Design a protein around this ligand. Structure first.
Ligand SMILES: *[C@@H]1O[C@H](CO)[C@@H](O[C@@H]2O[C@H](CO)[C@@H](O)[C@H](O)[C@H]2NC(C)=O)[C@H](O)[C@H]1NC(C)=O
Ligand SMILES: *[C@@H]1O[C@H](CO)[C@@H](O[C@@H]2O[C@H](CO)[C@@H](O)[C@H](O)[C@H]2NC(C)=O)[C@H](O)[C@H]1NC(C)=O
Ligand SMILES: *[C@@H]1O[C@H](CO)[C@@H](O)[C@H](O)[C@H]1NC(C)=O
Ligand SMILES: [Fe+3]
Ligand SMILES: [Mg+2]
Ligand code: NA
Lengths: 214, 683, 215
């Protein structure tokens, strides 16, 4: 097989920019390279075929280039609908092989998370369970860490994170990290904390609660 | 039995006299005497007159000595262990000139001698085929005198065209014996012809491959007050480029037989070889037989190139000279008094009768021999029967009729029609066009199971050639001459439109689409959308088939804006490729190098005995006056406006009539790719 | 226009087999090869194989061979793919695409078909309120449901801005999700905030009012 490698899996840019996504084949593919665009709803469009030819209907901002094993796709005067994932494919030899994708993300000013911690509801406790949810809302860039502390001591077993994709209005990210335990482990401890570390946070952001307090 | 060798000059006699005494001192038997002659041709008469016994001669001289005087070549020369008893002819010019092979008109030339191998027979014999010199009515002397601006041709003294053929000749201290076939004429033989070039008198010289190294690099004869260098000269190649003197193994005009000792048929043969090998064997020491610089000249008795003299098995001029040599001899050489007075053309209609009648008048008024006569025949096939029956002499035939004429009646092409470079309705290339897909690429040999778009049943390019080709190549192997079922079992699905079908396979109509409303599917006319070459090409672009067999022009006429039908409106030619019989793929623009076969232009078929050079010579001289459709000479050979017909005698599309060159046979004219497919279909 | 419409999301047990369809419209079905591609998160796109509907010629990717099988009914303009011996590694989004016949380019793609391989049994979610102890952020915890999806609304869609519903994560064989809403401090304790979670797969909806914790 011919392996297509795409340099970067994620790239950030703002409207009007010139962006270049790049592909690289395991062997000389003699310009038989196609470029596709996939939107978040799983809709796939063909943009360029055979290195540089535009598919009919494709805006001229998209342009293709390359030769040998190195190819690249360029988007001039970036527009709103261009923020999507871009794949490459070779038509040189079967089986056709694709790249891993490159997601174009909207650039924006760095913002800090709005951390909120919630103890288990009485309903879950009376059901024999206990989940402590901590929200980390509207931050940028996507990179962040969460540290769960129980009475000062670290914790990692019951934790599970979930990240959103860029918000439609804010262009920010959010994450939820919940720590699920038995009812009895929760009732054996007092203070609970979630710590958020971000680019903005030269020092972590801590939200905690006492099990004995309302 | 004393052997009286003949000498052609005083230094040749002195060498022979010194060799005789060197022989007897070593007790060589028999004796050797040296009779002196005025020329090489004079000496052959001395041999005929029993006044002399032996002489070494050039091929063209061995020819005439063996014919008009009947002497036999007994011993021959071996120049190199490489070239053996043969040598290569060349045409040489200075570095300070742009004269390539095909640019010799009005060029000053130097020749070794008339009716001589390297300076006349080979250069002129080649020029009639692949240099384009036409000879009309067997007058070779007129042809060469008009072609070259001026020439030095020793031996052409009492000829009609003496002025032109002896213009560059000088010779002798006093300037006497000019243009004589003697070493007297300073520009005679290889040595003199090359000297003619280097002394500025001439611009080209037809000499041996080795004569440039033999007269340069300090080997230049002292008498020529100069010291010529080998890198001041160049050969001319048959391709059309000027190579260097060293690469004569690639750059030569012909491989010709070696010179030989000719004696009378009456005279013993083994006696002459024993005497010479006795000396040659013992002297390789007391006497250098093949060198001759000690006498102030080149090539005395034997050419300096000679390394060894060998016995000859068959002592006849026909066997010694190559069979190829004698064939070129009987064509180029024709008696300008014993040629058929008339050339009888074959006509198949009353308008053809009238055009031919007018053609005979126009030709005769312009004094062009032979005279044309018109004989009517009811069919093109019936013409062939009459031509071979020696009732008719010539006719112009189509590709299919050329095959039947040469294979069944033994006819040969004498001249061919040549169409305009932009015209491609008559002689075109059959190609296999495919979509540009690398991941799904295939070769002309991996066509089994594919979908095929043919133009129509019996279409030359779309059916006859491709199916014929796959049968001969051994991919379609039919049973009981059932070709329809063989192709319908080879391709998974095809579109082969047909009219009046009876047991047509379903597969052969599978891809056809018919009317805009789907009616008339697979019908043999424009009602079927995939009918014809553009339909077959459409069948391909619409992904209905995988390969389309069409003409080289089909893709250009249906892509790049040249067709605004919606299916072809946005097509680009770069999205298509051609499959070659050799296995390669090529861009649509390389059809000349990547085609299945070329549909041959028409050609004039005559009998083998008929001198084809008089036929092309007549047509070329005629077309010089009557070829161009707007000539002011009162006849148009390639137009039929004056008659109630079209394509009379020749297709009106003919621009020029051309020589057959080396396609002297029906198979060679039709091409091998084309005959393979035709023969493939016959079974 | 050319359009390939694929079958709906399928949910199979491991070991079972599935048959995805892809009905083609707007062109001659018989002529163009139909490609089949697999998409999994963090695994790019994988070509399973192709079928030319005229004659049924197939080319399968070796890594799939055995698993995938293609057919095409030229009378109904529909191409099929069957996957056998299903496993969680087969849980992916499967597209049919069309080969233009030139440069191996796929100009027209299907919408995709979600295939999910799970031994889990249909289970409705357990919804818990997340209340706290400026702007105020509230939440909803949706635990232990199978299959996806659940739709989370706040006040039956009335509260639309300031909501963050997170992607579900497999707790074991059941899914779990959370959703946050942030409203002006004025509005929550005063005026009601409810969390609506719908699970069509189990025909269950539950509304959960976010009340402040009792002291
Ligand atoms: C050997 O060669 C020499 C050189 O040519 C011959 O010498 C000439 O002889 C003729 C009479 O035979 C004279 O007219 C010339 O004056 C001589 N020339 C020179 C340069 O000497 C010689 O005759 C030859 N020998 C034999 C046996 O024939
Ligand atoms: C030519 O036609 C045959 C029969 O229609 C095609 O055969 C199919 O081939 C695939 C594999 O390529 C098999 O899995 C099917 O079982 C075959 N079907 C039948 C009905 O035999 C064949 O592929 C076609 N060849 C080409 C080159 O397209
Ligand atoms: C060449 O050969 C022919 C043979 O018939 C002869 O008649 C002719 O005169 C020769 N040419 C010359 C100029 O000797
Ligand atoms: Fe010679
Ligand atoms: Mg039969
Ligand atoms: Na004409």
């Amino acid at each position: 097989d011919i392996q297509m490698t795409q340099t970067t899996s994620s790239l950030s840019a703002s409207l009007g920019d010139r962006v270049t996504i790049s592909c690289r084949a395991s062997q000389d593919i003699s310009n038989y390279l196609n470029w596709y665009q996939q939107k978040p709803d799983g809709t796939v469009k063909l943009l360029i075929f055979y290195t540089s030819r535009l598919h009919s209907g494709v805006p001229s901002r998209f342009s293709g280039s390359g030769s040998g094993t190195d190819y690249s796709l360029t988007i001039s005067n970036l527009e709103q609908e261009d923020f999507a994932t871009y794949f490459c494919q070779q038509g040189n030899t079967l089986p056709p092989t694709f790249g891993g994708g490159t997601k174009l993300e909207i650039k924006r000013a760095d913002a800090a998370p709005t951390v909120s911690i919630f103890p288990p509801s009485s309903e879950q406790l009376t059901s024999g369970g206990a989940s402590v949810v901590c929200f980390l809302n509207n931050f940028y860039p996507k990179d962040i860490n969460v540290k769960w502390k129980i009475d000062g001591s670290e914790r990692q077993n019951g934790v599970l994170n979930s990240w959103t994709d860029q918000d439609s209005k804010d262009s920010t990210y959010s994450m939820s990290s919940t720590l699920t335990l038995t009812k009895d482990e929760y009732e054996r401890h007092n203070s609970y904390t979630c710590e958020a570390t971000h680019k903005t946070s030269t020092s972590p952001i801590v939200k905690s609660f006492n099990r004995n307090e309302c | 039995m004393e052997v009286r060798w003949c000498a052609t000059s005083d230094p040749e006699q002195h060498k022979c006299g010194n060799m005789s005494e060197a022989f007897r001192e070593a007790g060589i038997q028999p004796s050797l005497l040296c009779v002196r002659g005025t020329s090489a041709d004079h000496c052959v008469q001395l041999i005929a007159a029993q006044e002399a016994d032996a002489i070494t001669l050039d091929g063209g001289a061995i020819y005439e000595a063996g014919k008009e005087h009947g002497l036999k070549p007994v011993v021959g020369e071996v120049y190199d262990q490489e070239v053996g008893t043969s040598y290569y002819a060349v045409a040489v010019v200075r570095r300070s000139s742009h004269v390539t092979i095909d640019t010799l008109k009005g060029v000053k030339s130097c020749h070794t001698g008339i009716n001589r191998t390297v300076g006349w027979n080979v250069p002129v014999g080649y020029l009639v085929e692949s240099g384009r010199l036409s000879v009309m009515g067997c007058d070779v002397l007129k042809a060469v005198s008009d072609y070259f601006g001026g020439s030095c041709v020793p031996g052409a003294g009492e000829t009609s065209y003496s002025e032109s053929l002896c213009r560059l000749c000088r010779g002798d201290s006093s300037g006497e014996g000019v243009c004589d076939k003697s070493p007297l004429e300073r520009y005679y033989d290889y040595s003199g012809a090359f000297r003619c070039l280097a002394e500025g008198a001439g611009d080209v010289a037809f000499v041996k491959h080795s004569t440039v190294l033999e007269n340069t690099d300090g080997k230049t004869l002292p008498s020529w007050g100069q010291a010529l260098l080998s890198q001041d000269f160049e050969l001319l190649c048959r391709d059309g480029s000027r190579a260097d003197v060293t690469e004569w193994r690639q750059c030569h005009l012909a491989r010709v037989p070696a010179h030989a000792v000719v004696v009378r048929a009456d005279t013993d043969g083994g006696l002459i070889f024993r005497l010479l090998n006795e000396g040659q064997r013992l002297f390789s020491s007391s006497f250098q037989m093949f060198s001759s610089e000690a006498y102030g000249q080149k090539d005395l008795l034997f050419k300096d190139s000679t390394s060894e003299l060998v016995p000859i098995a068959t002592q006849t001029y026909e066997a010694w000279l190559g069979h190829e040599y004698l064939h070129a001899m009987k064509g180029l050489l024709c008696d300008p008094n014993r040629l058929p007075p008339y050339l009888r053309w074959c006509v198949l209609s009353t308008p053809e009768i009238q055009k031919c009648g007018d053609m005979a008048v126009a030709f005769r008024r312009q004094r062009l021999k032979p005279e044309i006569q018109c004989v009517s025949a009811k069919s093109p096939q019936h013409c062939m029967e009459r031509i071979q029956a020696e009732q008719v002499d010539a006719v112009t035939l189509s590709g299919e009729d050329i095959y039947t004429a040469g294979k069944t009646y033994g006819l040969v092409p004498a001249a061919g029609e040549h169409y305009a470079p932009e015209d491609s309705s008559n002689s075109y290339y059959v190609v296999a066009v495919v979509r540009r897909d690398s991941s799904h690429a295939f070769t002309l040999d991996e066509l089994r199971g594919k979908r095929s778009c043919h133009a129509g049943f019996g279409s030359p390019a779309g059916w006859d050639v491709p199916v014929g080709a796959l049968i001969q190549r051994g991919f379609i192997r039919p049973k009981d001459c059932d070709v329809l079922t063989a192709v319908s079992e080879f391709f998974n699905a095809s579109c082969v439109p047909v009219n009046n079908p009876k047991n047509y396979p379903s597969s052969l109509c599978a891809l056809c689409v018919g009317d805009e409303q789907g009616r008339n599917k697979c019908v043999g006319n424009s009602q079927e959308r995939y009918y014809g070459y553009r339909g077959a090409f459409r069948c391909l672009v619409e992904n209905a088939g995988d390969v389309a067999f069409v003409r080289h022009t089909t893709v250009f006429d249906n892509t790049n804006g040249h067709n605004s039908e919606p299916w072809a409106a946005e097509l680009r030619s770069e999205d298509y490729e051609l499959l070659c019989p050799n296995g390669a793929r090529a861009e649509v623009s390389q059809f000349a190098a990547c085609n299945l076969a070329q549909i041959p232009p028409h050609a004039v078929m005559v009998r083998p005995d008929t001198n084809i050079f008089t036929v092309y010579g007549l047509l070329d001289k005629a077309q010089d006056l009557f070829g161009d459709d707007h000539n002011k000479n009162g006849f148009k050979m390639f137009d039929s406006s004056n008659y109630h017909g079209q394509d009379l005698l020749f297709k009106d599309a003919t621009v020029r009539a051309v020589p057959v060159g080396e396609k002297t046979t029906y198979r060679g004219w039709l091409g091998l790719d084309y005959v393979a497919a035709l023969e493939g279909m016959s079974s | 226009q050319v359009q390939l419409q694929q079958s709906g999301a399928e949910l199979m047990k491991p070991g079972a087999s599935v048959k995805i369809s892809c009905k083609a419209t707007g062109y001659t079905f018989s002529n163009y090869r139909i490609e089949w591609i697999k998409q999994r998160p963090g695994h790019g796109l994988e070509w399973i194989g192709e079928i030319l509907p005229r004659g049924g010629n197939t080319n399968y990717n070796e890594k799939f061979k055995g698993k995938a099988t293609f057919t095409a009914d030229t009378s109904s303009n529909t191409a099929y793919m069957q996957l056998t011996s299903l496993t969680s590694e087969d849980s992916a989004v499967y597209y049919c695409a069309r080969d233009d016949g030139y440069y191996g380019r796929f100009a027209y793609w299907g919408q995709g078909t979600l295939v999910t391989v799970s031994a889990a049994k249909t289970t409705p979610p357990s919804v818990y309120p997340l209340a706290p102890g400026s702007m105020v952020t509230l939440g909803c915890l949706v635990k232990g449901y199978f299959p996806e999806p659940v739709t989370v609304t706040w006040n039956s869609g009335s509260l639309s801005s300031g909501v963050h519903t997170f992607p579900a994560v497999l707790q074991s064989d059941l899914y779990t999700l959370s959703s946050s809403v942030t409203v002006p401090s004025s509005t929550w304790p005063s005026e009601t905030v409810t969390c609506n979670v719908a699970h069509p797969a189990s025909s269950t909806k539950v509304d959960k009012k976010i009340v402040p914790r009792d002291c």
